[PDB]
Design an enzyme around this catalytic site. Structure first.
Site, PDB file in Angstrom:
ATOM      1  N   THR A 157     -78.189  23.085 -15.739  1.00 52.66           N
ATOM      2  CA  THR A 157     -77.426  22.003 -15.287  1.00 52.66           C
ATOM      3  C   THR A 157     -77.144  22.075 -13.817  1.00 52.66           C
ATOM      4  O   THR A 157     -76.556  21.269 -13.108  1.00 52.66           O
ATOM      5  CB  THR A 157     -75.893  22.196 -15.981  1.00 52.66           C
ATOM      6  OG1 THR A 157     -75.261  23.134 -15.372  1.00 52.66           O
ATOM      7  CG2 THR A 157     -76.084  22.049 -17.436  1.00 52.66           C
ATOM      8  N   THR A 158     -77.937  23.061 -12.989  1.00 54.69           N
ATOM      9  CA  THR A 158     -77.924  23.033 -11.563  1.00 54.69           C
ATOM     10  C   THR A 158     -79.349  23.024 -11.229  1.00 54.69           C
ATOM     11  O   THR A 158     -80.334  23.432 -11.981  1.00 54.69           O
ATOM     12  CB  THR A 158     -77.166  24.469 -11.047  1.00 54.69           C
ATOM     13  OG1 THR A 158     -77.964  25.444 -11.807  1.00 54.69           O
ATOM     14  CG2 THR A 158     -75.964  24.366 -11.271  1.00 54.69           C
ATOM     15  N   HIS A 190     -67.601  26.341 -14.855  1.00 52.46           N
ATOM     16  CA  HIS A 190     -67.948  25.220 -14.445  1.00 52.46           C
ATOM     17  C   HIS A 190     -66.391  24.639 -14.366  1.00 52.46           C
ATOM     18  O   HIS A 190     -65.876  24.708 -15.449  1.00 52.46           O
ATOM     19  CB  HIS A 190     -68.834  24.091 -14.917  1.00 52.46           C
ATOM     20  CG  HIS A 190     -70.204  24.733 -14.885  1.00 52.46           C
ATOM     21  ND1 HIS A 190     -71.003  24.081 -13.794  1.00 52.46           N
ATOM     22  CD2 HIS A 190     -70.957  25.247 -15.676  1.00 52.46           C
ATOM     23  CE1 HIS A 190     -72.262  24.825 -13.864  1.00 52.46           C
ATOM     24  NE2 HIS A 190     -72.143  25.295 -14.984  1.00 52.46           N
ATOM     25  N   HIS A 207     -70.437  29.300 -19.162  1.00 45.83           N
ATOM     26  CA  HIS A 207     -71.863  29.381 -19.608  1.00 45.83           C
ATOM     27  C   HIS A 207     -72.494  30.892 -19.675  1.00 45.83           C
ATOM     28  O   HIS A 207     -72.871  31.374 -18.708  1.00 45.83           O
ATOM     29  CB  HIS A 207     -72.835  28.606 -18.862  1.00 45.83           C
ATOM     30  CG  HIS A 207     -72.652  27.064 -19.071  1.00 45.83           C
ATOM     31  ND1 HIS A 207     -73.109  26.425 -17.924  1.00 45.83           N
ATOM     32  CD2 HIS A 207     -72.268  26.530 -19.962  1.00 45.83           C
ATOM     33  CE1 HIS A 207     -72.497  24.817 -18.572  1.00 45.83           C
ATOM     34  NE2 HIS A 207     -72.074  25.129 -19.476  1.00 45.83           N
ATOM     35  N   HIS A 245     -71.424  32.436 -16.036  1.00 43.64           N
ATOM     36  CA  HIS A 245     -70.490  31.674 -14.949  1.00 43.64           C
ATOM     37  C   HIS A 245     -69.719  30.531 -15.575  1.00 43.64           C
ATOM     38  O   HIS A 245     -69.884  30.266 -16.536  1.00 43.64           O
ATOM     39  CB  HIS A 245     -71.567  31.073 -13.903  1.00 43.64           C
ATOM     40  CG  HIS A 245     -72.374  30.103 -14.411  1.00 43.64           C
ATOM     41  ND1 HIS A 245     -73.634  30.459 -15.090  1.00 43.64           N
ATOM     42  CD2 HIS A 245     -72.349  28.965 -14.480  1.00 43.64           C
ATOM     43  CE1 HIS A 245     -74.284  29.258 -15.371  1.00 43.64           C
ATOM     44  NE2 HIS A 245     -73.414  28.454 -15.296  1.00 43.64           N
ATOM     45  N   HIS A 304     -71.830  27.872  -5.435  1.00 46.86           N
ATOM     46  CA  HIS A 304     -71.617  26.986  -6.254  1.00 46.86           C
ATOM     47  C   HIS A 304     -70.910  27.238  -7.468  1.00 46.86           C
ATOM     48  O   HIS A 304     -70.487  26.381  -8.511  1.00 46.86           O
ATOM     49  CB  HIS A 304     -72.942  26.267  -6.649  1.00 46.86           C
ATOM     50  CG  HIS A 304     -73.970  27.162  -7.075  1.00 46.86           C
ATOM     51  ND1 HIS A 304     -73.693  27.507  -8.568  1.00 46.86           N
ATOM     52  CD2 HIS A 304     -75.177  27.633  -6.908  1.00 46.86           C
ATOM     53  CE1 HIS A 304     -74.795  28.271  -8.758  1.00 46.86           C
ATOM     54  NE2 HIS A 304     -75.623  28.582  -7.818  1.00 46.86           N
ATOM     55  N   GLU A 308     -68.651  20.359 -18.439  1.00 46.57           N
ATOM     56  CA  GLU A 308     -70.117  19.520 -18.171  1.00 46.57           C
ATOM     57  C   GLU A 308     -70.517  18.852 -19.458  1.00 46.57           C
ATOM     58  O   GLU A 308     -70.492  17.669 -19.424  1.00 46.57           O
ATOM     59  CB  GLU A 308     -71.340  20.627 -17.842  1.00 46.57           C
ATOM     60  CG  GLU A 308     -71.095  21.262 -16.443  1.00 46.57           C
ATOM     61  CD  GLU A 308     -72.118  21.735 -15.946  1.00 46.57           C
ATOM     62  OE1 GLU A 308     -73.024  22.641 -16.343  1.00 46.57           O
ATOM     63  OE2 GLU A 308     -72.511  21.418 -14.511  1.00 46.57           O
TER      64      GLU A 308
HETATM   65  N1  LIG Z   1     -79.147  26.756  -9.919  1.00 44.86           N
HETATM   66  C1  LIG Z   1     -79.948  27.809  -9.153  1.00 44.86           C
HETATM   67  C2  LIG Z   1     -78.774  28.863  -8.487  1.00 44.86           C
HETATM   68  C3  LIG Z   1     -78.851  29.926  -9.464  1.00 44.86           C
HETATM   69  C4  LIG Z   1     -80.007  30.579  -9.566  1.00 44.86           C
HETATM   70  C5  LIG Z   1     -79.846  32.028 -10.335  1.00 44.86           C
HETATM   71  C6  LIG Z   1     -78.784  32.439 -10.949  1.00 44.86           C
HETATM   72  C7  LIG Z   1     -77.621  31.563 -10.758  1.00 44.86           C
HETATM   73  C8  LIG Z   1     -77.696  30.220  -9.985  1.00 44.86           C
HETATM   74  C9  LIG Z   1     -80.167  27.096  -7.709  1.00 44.86           C
HETATM   75  O1  LIG Z   1     -79.421  26.618  -7.079  1.00 44.86           O
HETATM   76  O2  LIG Z   1     -81.388  27.122  -7.324  1.00 44.86           O
HETATM   77 ZN   LIG Z   2     -73.564  26.466 -16.064  1.00 46.70          ZN
END
Ligand SMILES: N[C@H](Cc1ccccc1)C(=O)O
Ligand SMILES: [Zn+2]
Ligand SMILES: [Hg+2]
EC number: 4.2.1.1
Length: 257
Positions: free
Chosen positions: A195-196, A93, A116, A91, A61, A103
């Site tokens: 945000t995820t 976006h 971010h 990371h 992602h 975002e």
């Molecule tokens: N947004 C977290 C993913 C994630 C976790 C830890 C570090 C970076 C990204 C998830 O998809 O469950």
């Molecule tokens: Zn982010």
């Protein structure tokens, strides 16, 4: 699995993660004329001189540039923060076109991308425990606009070829995140969330007003990454951004007048 597509995108997240419709969700639109200068805000301290990057990962992602956070080597403090927050990873976006990708938005304006830098409050021992606290994380958000190239970002750009697909990672040591920071540290701050998914509401957001400029060539490289894993049809990694969410009972404070 959650994603950014029509059937698994942001509008679907609330089903597996009810908090998506919570009271302090991110991102949000920053209405500059509604934000108020806050005299109580202390000076922001970004100390990345001892930062130790270790690896870069395509997680399906976005891509994470990971840091060694077993000690205070890269920390964020001051500003609206109480205590010390350690950099764990950063990371971005971005969009499929330069007119979208960020975002957070400023007076509804969308930037080409958003960086971010994620930090966790050391008083909680580890990242996992921090994301269970209202003041567990501090994320420094930086907008990206397309124009001149950003020298400090090229090292990241050139390694993307080695982690094109989901699950791929590569050694990424000695990367200096100071090279991704704009000149000014003026910022807006508000309490929000990841945000995820799991969209946990444990973040103190610090969004810099000054965007950094990256070249069209650099952003185009980002758009060559894949959401899919190797051996699967190609789905370009683009538009991995969540739209602005209701501000609700929150006030955005500015560090400048
Ligand atoms: N947004 C977290 C993913 C994630 C976790 C830890 C570090 C970076 C990204 C998830 O998809 O469950
Ligand atoms: Zn982010
Ligand atoms: Hg929390």
């Amino acid at each position: 699995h959650w994603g950014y597509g029509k059937h698994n995108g942001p509008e679907h997240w609330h089903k597996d993660f009810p908090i998506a419709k919570g009271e302090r969700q991110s991102p949000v639109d920053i209405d500059t004329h509604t934000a108020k200068y806050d005299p109580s805000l202390k000076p922001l301290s970004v100390s990345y001189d001892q930062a130790t990057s270790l690896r870069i990962l395509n997680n399906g992602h976005a891509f994470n540039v990971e840091f060694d956070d077993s000690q205070d080597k890269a920390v964020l403090k001051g500003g609206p923060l109480d205590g010390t927050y350690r950099l764990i990873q950063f990371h971005f976006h971005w969009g499929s076109l330069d007119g979208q990708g960020s975002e957070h938005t400023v007076d509804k304006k969308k930037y080409a991308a958003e960086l971010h830098l994620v930090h966790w409050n050391t008083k909680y021992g580890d990242f996992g425990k921090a994301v269970q606290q209202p003041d567990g994380l501090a994320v420094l958000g930086i907008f990206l606009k397309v124009g001149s190239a950003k020298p400090g970002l090229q090292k990241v750009v050139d390694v993307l070829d080695s982690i094109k697909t989901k699950g791929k990672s590569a050694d990424f040591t000695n990367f200096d995140p100071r090279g991704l920071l704009p000149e000014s540290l003026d910022y807006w701050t508000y309490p929000g969330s990841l945000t995820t998914p799991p969209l946990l509401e444990c973040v103190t957001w610090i969004v810099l007003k000054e965007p950094i400029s990256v070249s069209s060539e650099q952003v185009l490289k980002f758009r060559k990454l894949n959401f899919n894993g190797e051996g699967e049809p190609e789905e370009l990694m683009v538009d991995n951004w969540r739209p602005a969410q209701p501000l609700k009972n929150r006030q955005i404070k500015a560090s400048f007048k």
